[PDB]
Amino acid sequence: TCTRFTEEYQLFEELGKGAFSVVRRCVKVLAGQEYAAKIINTKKLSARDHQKLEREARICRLLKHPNIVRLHDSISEEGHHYLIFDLVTGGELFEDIVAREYYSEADASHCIQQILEAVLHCHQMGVVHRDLKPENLLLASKLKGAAVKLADFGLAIEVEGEQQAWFGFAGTPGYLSPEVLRKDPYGKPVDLWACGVILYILLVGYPPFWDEDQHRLYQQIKAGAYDFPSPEWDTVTPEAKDLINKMLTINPSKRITAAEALKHPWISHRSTVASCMHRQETVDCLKKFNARRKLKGAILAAM
Amino acid sequence: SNATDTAEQVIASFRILASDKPYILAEELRRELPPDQAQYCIKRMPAYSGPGSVPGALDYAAFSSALY
Ligand SMILES: Nc1ncnc2c1ncn2[C@@H]1O[C@H](COP(=O)(O)OP(=O)(O)NP(=O)(O)O)[C@@H](O)[C@H]1O
Ligand SMILES: [Mg+2]
Numbered sequence: 001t002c003t004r005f006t007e008e009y010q011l012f013e014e015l016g017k018g019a020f021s022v023v024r025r026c027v028k029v030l031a032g033q034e035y036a037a038k039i040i041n042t043k044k045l046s047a048r049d050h051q052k053l054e055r056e057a058r059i060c061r062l063l064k065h066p067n068i069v070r071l072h073d074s075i076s077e078e079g080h081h082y083l084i085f086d087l088v089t090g091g092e093l094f095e096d097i098v099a100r101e102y103y104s105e106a107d108a109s110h111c112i113q114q115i116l117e118a119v120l121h122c123h124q125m126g127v128v129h130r131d132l133k134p135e136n137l138l139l140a141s142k143l144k145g146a147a148v149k150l151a152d153f154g155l156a157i158e159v160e161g162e163q164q165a166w167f168g169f170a171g172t173p174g175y176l177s178p179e180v181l182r183k184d185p186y187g188k189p190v191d192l193w194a195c196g197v198i199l200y201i202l203l204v205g206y207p208p209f210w211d212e213d214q215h216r217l218y219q220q221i222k223a224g225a226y227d228f229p230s231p232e233w234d235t236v237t238p239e240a241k242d243l244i245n246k247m248l249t250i251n252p253s254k255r256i257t258a259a260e261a262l263k264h265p266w267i268s269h270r271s272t273v274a275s276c277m278h279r280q281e282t283v284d285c286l287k288k289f290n291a292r293r294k295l296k297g298a299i300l301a302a303m
Numbered sequence: 304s305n306a307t308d309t310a311e312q313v314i315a316s317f318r319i320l321a322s323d324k325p326y327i328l329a330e331e332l333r334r335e336l337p338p339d340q341a342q343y344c345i346k347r348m349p350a351y352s353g354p355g356s357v358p359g360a361l362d363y364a365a366f367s368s369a370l371y
Contacts (some may be wrong), residue, residue: 016305135304152304212337284332289314298308299340302370
């Protein structure tokens with residue numbers, strides 16, 4: 001009979017939607033302060049889905065970092081759960097890169113540094129995100145230089161120190177790690193593989209692994225079969241390629257960690273190591289990357 | 304991830320894959336989309352007869368707003 005969200009917050013327009021959530025702008029009425037309310041209708045959830053919802057809420061409460069969405073409040077009502085986050089208004093990172101038109105390695109390095117700081121924080125708190133991908137990288141605001149914010153802890157899991165386990169087949173196909181595809185025990189390194197996929201896209205605007213046949217895609221991932229083809233990779237610094245190679249290492253025990261990646265010279269010495277040259281082809285490809293993503297989901301939604 | 308798909312986003316995405324043309328071609332759909340998704344639009348997109356039409360021009364705009 002307690003209805004604290006209904007009593008104290010006013011909902012406005014939809015900011016986004018998930019498979020089983022809607023995110024609406026809300027205002028804490030007494031304060032006049034805006035937030036984002038992630039709302040899950042709980043009336044028809046299975047027992048396992050309740051457990052996943054409770055897990056996301058616990059993990060979101062735990063994570064306080066400048067590059068991670070920040071939970072303000074959490075409210076349970078009869079048929080609804082509300083996760084109330086600080087509002088981020090900059091939209092998706094990849095949409096912003098295209099909209100601002102110009103992009104260099106130095107920009108990509110600054111961006112992946114923030115993603116790695118967020119990932120490191122998760123890992124230091126015993127959380128593996130498992131779903132790092134462009135759609136979960138938001139920007140804090142429309143201000144130039146706004147912070148990247150890692151979002152959507154709906155697939156995140158809790159690990160104990162460095163122990164690996166079969167935590168299940170979860171994630172998004174193009175970002176899945178070899179160890180997950182092999183059904184091997186896994187842990188924190190899965191996030192660094194995904195970071196390597198993201199970094200590759202930030203440099204050239206298309207994904208390292210891509211095949212319409214998903215069986216073949218997974219074969220390519222498991223084989224680590226990516227390339228740095230000419231001409232676009234000819235102008236990418238050796239240090240950027242080196243960091244990608246170390247993230248896209250099939251053996252998760254040899255794959256670079258978030259802490260180590262933050263010390264890599266292309267990150268830590270970005271001002272002297274990363275190229276400042278604008279990469280027009282990268283932005284043009286990213287525009288098509290974003291378009292293919294949108295149509296893939298919209299063509300399936302219409303089917 | 305955000306699952307919201309709007310008509311303006313779908314039309315603009317098709318227009319991007321059509322290299323900014325006001326229509327899209329079958330071979331462009333086959334290059335850019337999964338073979339299954341490439342055949343779907345090819346079967347359900349009406350012929351484009353607007354400004355700058357060519358043989359094979361498909362009206363992704365009419366297709367898109369029919370749904371979204
Ligand atoms: N704090 C926030 N501020 C503003 N918009 C937000 C915020 N959190 C989420 N959104 C928007 O809502 C969308 C969906 O949020 P998300 O947490 O990814 O939902 P989800 O239900 O877990 N999606 P999915 O699991 O991929 O089906 C995001 O992509 C943003 O567009
Ligand atoms: Mg989710």
